[PDB]
Structure formats: structure tokens, C-alpha cells
Symmetry: D2
């Protein structure tokens, strides 16, 4: 009865890392509210789980949607122990090929959408609770073709730090996981990507969504003297190993 009586919101929990995090929460006995954008993913969840989990379709980028999301969460959960921010999008292109539209899209979801979602949902967080952000190994260093994604994630990591400072009086810890290549789901080059992660990750494999899930829930419930910190789940990729 580990997560018994605990309540969590996972933003972007219909899929991959978020969903793996949802599975551990539910099997640990927690009550979970999760969001996603895609109709198909929500449909699957609503069938597989039932009313021990609340699947809400909600665009992280829409501030009006965020306000309604906060009203519903407060109604359903009342108050929570964990807010997990997981939603993220990426468009790989060389720096001089970035258009204003592609630039805006990625920052809308990855940075601004996350900030205002956090701003709306933070008053529901109980003392002793926490926020865990899903970042990326890309949040430090220079990776060609990821100028916008890497930068949107670096900003998110900065938000976690200031949120960790400003939320001290409320006894809410704020931390980030930094995943490398994680094997989860355009297929034929989604495939080419997983190979890259195999070649270049020092541990020579992709991570599992459950490995990220484990790191998220550790920071949430066990790292009770940890705030403003970052935790690598990258097979050594961000750790300067030759």
C-alpha cells in the first residue's frame, strides 16, 4: 500500500513515459488524473483502466483549456501529492531551416504550456508534495537539429529551479528527470532513431519507459530532501563519458 491515499496528476500520461508512470501509480494504489491531446490514446486508456483513473483530453498549449483543466482536477482530486509534467513535442531541423511556426509550436507545448499548466495546478499541491518535470539529455550541450527542442527543455529546467526556490515556504519539492534515448513510440525513421541511441549511448542501449517511471516516482515520494535537482536516465549519455 505504497501510494495508497496519494493523488497524482500526470500531464501527458496517455503514452510512453507518462503512461508507464501512470501504470506504477495505479498499481501502487494511487488515484490518478491524466491528460493527453490525441483522441485514440484517450479512448484506449478509458477502456483499459476505468474510473480509478480519470483521462481528460486537454491541450497543454491552450490557456483556456488549462483553466478548465484546473477546475476539473480540483473538483475530482481536491488536492494532490504529485504533479508530473510529461508532455513534449519535437521537430528536427537544422537551425537555418527553423521557421517561426515550427519554433512557436515547440515552445508553446514544451515551455509556455508547461509553465501555465504548473501555474494553474500548483495550488492543488499538498504540503510535502512535489512537482516532477520530464526534461531531456538535450537540455545541456549542443545537438544539431535540436536547437528549438533543446532550448525549450533548457528553459523548463530553469523554471524547475525558480519554482524550487519560490515553493520552499509551501513545503513543495520541485525536480526534473533527464532521459536519454528511451524505446517507446513515422515508424521507418522512428526506427533509425532507436539505432542511433544504441550506437551512441555509452550503455549501448535504449532506456525503458518504466526506468524513467521509476526515477520519476523516486523523486516524487522518496527523495524528500531533494529539491531543485536533476536526475539522469540516459545510459550515461549526458555524463561526459568517453
Amino acid at each position: 500500500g505504497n501510494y495508497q491515499g496519494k493523488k497524482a496528476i500526470v500531464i501527458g500520461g496517455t503514452h510512453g513515459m507518462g503512461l508507464a508512470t501512470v501504470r506504477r501509480l495505479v498499481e501502487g494504489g494511487a488515484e490518478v488524473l491524466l491528460t493527453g491531446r490525441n483522441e485514440s490514446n484517450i479512448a484506449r486508456i478509458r477502456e483499459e483502466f476505468g474510473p480509478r483513473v480519470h483521462a481528460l483530453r486537454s491541450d497543454i498549449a491552450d490557456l483556456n483549456e488549462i483553466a478548465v483543466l484546473g477546475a476539473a482536477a480540483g473538483q475530482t482530486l481536491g488536492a494532490i501529492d504529485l504533479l508530473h509534467i510529461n508532455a513534449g513535442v519535437s521537430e528536427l531541423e537544422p537551425f537555418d531551416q527553423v521557421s517561426e511556426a515550427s519554433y512557436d509550436r515547440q515552445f508553446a507545448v514544451n515551455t509556455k504550456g508547461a509553465f501555465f499548466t504548473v501555474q494553474r495546478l500548483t495550488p492543488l499541491i499538498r504540503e510535502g508534495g512535489s512537482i516532477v518535470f520530464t526534461s531531456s539529455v538535450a537540455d545541456e550541450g549542443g545537438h544539431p537539429g535540436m536547437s528549438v527542442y533543446s532550448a525549450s527543455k533548457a528553459a523548463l529546467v530553469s523554471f524547475a529551479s525558480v519554482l524550487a526556490a519560490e515553493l520552499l515556504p509551501r513545503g513543495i519539492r520541485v525536480n526534473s528527470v533527464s532521459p536519454g534515448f528511451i524505446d517507446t513510440p513515422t515508424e521507418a525513421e522512428r526506427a533509425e532513431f532507436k539505432t542511433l541511441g544504441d550506437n551512441i549511448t555509452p550503455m549501448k542501449r535504449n532506456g525503458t519507459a518504466d526506468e524513467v517511471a521509476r526515477a520519476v516516482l523516486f523523486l516524487a515520494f522518496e527523495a524528500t530532501f531533494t529539491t531543485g535537482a536533476k536526475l539522469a536516465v540516459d545510459g550515461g549519455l549526458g555524463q561526459k563519458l568517453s
Copy 2:
């Protein structure tokens, strides 16, 4: 110490650190073009310097103006050794006070405009040349009331890294300076008054390990070292912060 035959663009060079940088560039023999958003600041620049430097009123946040700026630079300088991105704005707000408008404003100038300005001007940059970003000690760690500003600067540092990686085949270095409470007429924050700046400066004196504010010239020296002397340096950061971001357990 001599920039004879060099040409440089300073985005946000109308006062403070950027202007200090302009001054050393000119005094060393550089051909310089600078921008600013405020019009009377531009007038003062044209008076101090005369036809010696090219000063353009140009909003960094505006993509049409960035295009106009690009053509102007290509027309007046043709090809450059240094692009200094210095422009910044900041609005101090506790995290639950931040509005969409104030959020958008700071990212528009500090992050998006810097990205697209660099995108438009990078073709002018010659082999051996460099881009220097002005970041902030706030680009790392948690400073209350500076959530948006810190994040917009953290984003800029990331861009500096990816640019350093992508521009390697062009032999263009990309680095960042990180101040630092710097004694300047805006203090980095335009909205506040003279009263609230004098207090911001004093906060600087108290919490800076070296017990003082930096000068604009100290920042300028670091920008120009990175631009012209640090020829084996790229993707790096150089602190000009009196120790503030260096984890010195005083006081």
C-alpha cells in the same frame, strides 16, 4: 587590443554593457553597427559617436525589422567578425503573478528575437569569426521573481550550444558571457525607477561575494576576449559576476 579591419554588430548597444563594448570596438579601430529599440537612446549614440558608427532603431522582437536589419548590415558592413547579442528585458514577478502578456514579452526579446536575429545575420559571419551572447548569472539556479527572465536566458544558453555545434564547419565560434550585478543605468530592469534601481544595486553589493557591482567595461573586456582572443573556445560560458554564480559559501 586592436580591432583595425574588424567589423562588428552589437544588438542592443545603445547603453550599458553593449555600449561599453561598442566603445572598446571603436577605440580599437573596428567598424561597428549597433541597434536599440528606444529612439532617444539612438539620438544620443549618434551624438557621442557621429557618423563613425552605424546606429539603427531596430526592434529585436520584430521579424520584419530583423529582415530590414539583415539587409542594412549586408549593405553597410558586407561581412563581419563579431555578432554580439546583448539585448534583453526583464520584469520581476512572483511565479503566480506572471501573465501571458509579460511572459510573451520577455521570451519575444530575450529568446525568440535573438534566435531569429542570429538566423538572419549568420550568413554575414566570416570564417574565424564569432558570436557572443550576453546571458546572465540567472541562467542557472533558482532566483525568486525571475522565473521568466531566468528561463528565457537559460534557453539562450542552449541556443548558444547548438549554434556552436552547427557552425563548426563554418569555423564560427559561439560563446556566452554571464553577468553579474553590473552597475548600469537600467540595471537590466527598465520598468522600475531610480529609487528601485539604487536598491537593486545595493542588493548587488551585499550578495555579490566580491562585495560590489561589476562595471560595464569589465563585461565588454570579456566579450571582446571571447570574440577575438579565445580562438580555441566554443560553446563555453564566461562568468563576470563577482563570484555570484560560482557557489562561494559567503556570506
Copy 3:
């Protein structure tokens, strides 16, 4: 059965966070060999834990004794899943007062002894096993009075990185915990008075405004040891934010 069948070595597991790590190990079903120096501590732990622990009096700074621990560990445990290096000493003094003797004591234990202990015991570590080092928030930045201690832990963190790289082909992960102020009944002594004054300092400079518990560090060591299977060369702060630049 959480750590059922598991085998671990905790270097300096006689007190505090090393001892809290031993406890969580034994409670989850692991067999542990630990080392230390204090007679009463070692005797007490033998008494408490019986056949689940092997407690050895072994000076981490003594290379002759490291060789004996290697024979003993290999004889008593054979193959292991976790090597936890926790042992450390601190001597607080301004830089201009550090003696050669005081400098040597801290490095002998915190760094060299750690290095040669890891060198000697690494061959026992199973594939899929790991090493965890106890560092300190002092391993980065500048803290007056702690020049030697800070440098010694900074060297340890470096060792951890190079080991994480060299041990990739064995499938052995190498990570570090970086504790801040951690609190340590009811016994008298001059150590225990010095511990009190330091605890008090930690209460009011740590951003979370309290010391951490030994169990909090132990939980982080054992997460890295057994749960962070895609984590190596990494550092994990248990410092109430002290190391994370929060104003």
C-alpha cells in the same frame, strides 16, 4: 524479499548514513559486509544483526588492511551486487593553517583509500551490479575552512566518472550521492558536541531549512544501486537544495 539474495559491501557502514544503508539492505533481505574503526560500534552491530552481516574493523587508509579485506570479503561473500563507498573524514581549518599531517589524513581516507579499496573489491562485483560513492555538497564550490575535505570529495566524484566509463563493458554502473547537512541517544563526547553546532548551521543555511536524515541518504543510495538501471556516471543530491543555487 526486495533485496532477496542480494550481496553488498558498505565501506564505512558503522554509523550514520552508512549504517542506515546497511539497515535498509538487511531489512530487504540482503547479506552485508561492512567496515569501520570504532570497537563499540562494530561490536554493537555484530550483536544486533547476527549472521546477516559481517562487520570488519578495517582502516580504509591502510593498503595492507585493504588487501586483507579483499581476501576476507572474497572468502566471506564471494560475488557481490553492490559496493558502497561511504567512509569519510573532515578536519575544518582555514587554508593557511592546514598542515601536511592534516592534509594527508583527509586525502588518505577520502580519496586514496577509496581508490584502492574500489580497485581491490571491484573484481567481486557481478555483472549488473553497481558502485555508489558518498560524496558531499562540498564537492563543488568554495566553502571556507573545508579546502581539503572539499577537494578530496571532488576527486572522488571524478573517480566515479572514470570508473563509470571503464566499467561499461562489465555492465557495472557507477554513481554518486551528494549529501548536504545530515543529522545523526544520547552519548557524550567532544565529537558529539561538534556535530551539534554543525547541525545548527545546516538548519539555517539549507534552503529547505532542516538537516536531512540518514534514511533519506540510504534511500537514494539504494535507488541508484538497484532501481536506476539506465543511470551511470551520474550524481544525486540529497541536500535540501543547498547545492542547487537557490537564492
Copy 4:
């Protein structure tokens, strides 16, 4: 004229980047005292500079010799504006092959010797002066064959931090430079063959993002910038590494 009237001590300035720093100091009008362990290299320094520089055989690893150097520095320079700790050794060994002797030799020069040299000479540094340490890109991250050297430099960088904090009230700044595969006669590893240095050099050209080794002068320029121009900089690190330590995924 830019270092006119200044006095500097370079610890390890008989060749390589230490010598590049000395040469830049002397062109700028500085008065310089430099050290090295190799008496033949010291003879070569006196051949080049004559008496415009003070050159002393002084083993950084020996505390007795450090004490002697402290007296000699006092007598010769009186007070100084720059202390540059550059001396170093490296021995490349897989971790499982490191012997007590090889470990001791590297920490004795790189860490302990550096510490007690700074401790003995700090009283000579005057108002507004500084200390600069030469670290390495190896002081962060994991590089096989370099467990001892990397840890010894990682330790040096921590010393710089604490010293920057403890020396604040004396108005003395303390910073480090971090090369970088640098083209020096030893490549920082004095004990290997020239076949292995050439390979080390080639490795440098391949893994370095800027795809070349750095020059000794490039490091010298960064040391002297920190020494004299970075007057609001302390406890900081400056990369001179062609991007190697900056996580460029090229």
C-alpha cells in the same frame, strides 16, 4: 607596457603552455620568476632569456623545496600580482593497473604540491592580484586511462573554489583554465614514447569538435586575461578546449 611594473610567478614555466605564458609576460614588461624540476630545461631558459627572468629548479612535490622557493620568491620579487600554477604530470593507466607509486606521483605534483606552493606564496600576492590554475578538460567526466590524473585535476579545481572564497577579503581573485588537447612537447604526458604522443595528438584532432589541437599561446592568452582583465571574475573556470568539454554532439 601592458604588464609594465607587474611581477609574476609561473610554477612550471620551463616549456609548453607554461613557457608560452612566461614569454607573453616578458613581452608585456612583467618581471617573472619561473620554476621547473628539469635542471637541463632550466639551463635552456637562462640561455633564452638571460637575466630578464628568474629561473629556479624547484620540485613542486617537495615541501622542503617549496619552503626554499618561498624564501627565494620573497627575496627576488618582494610581492607579486600573479601566481600561475601550471606544473603537472600524467601517467596513463587502466584503473585496474594503477599502482600506489603511480597514484602518489601524480597527486604529489598535481594536487598536494600545488596546494602547499599556493599556501607558501599567497602571502606575497598583493591587493588586486590573482591566482590562476591550469586544470584540464579531464577535470569533469570520465576518460579511461586517466582515473588518477582526472581526479587530481578535479581536486585542483575545488581548491581554486575554496581559495576564491577564502581570499575575498584580501581582494585576490582565483580562477582556472581548462585545456584542451594542446600541442606541447610532452602533450602533458612526459613518460610515453613519441609514437604514443603522436597517436594522442591524432586522437585529439578527431574527437575535438573544432577538429584540431590548441596552441600553447591560446592557453597563455586565457591565463593572462584571467590574471589581469577579468577583474570581476573569481572562482570561475575558462575552457580552452575546442569545444571538447562543452557537450557538442558532433
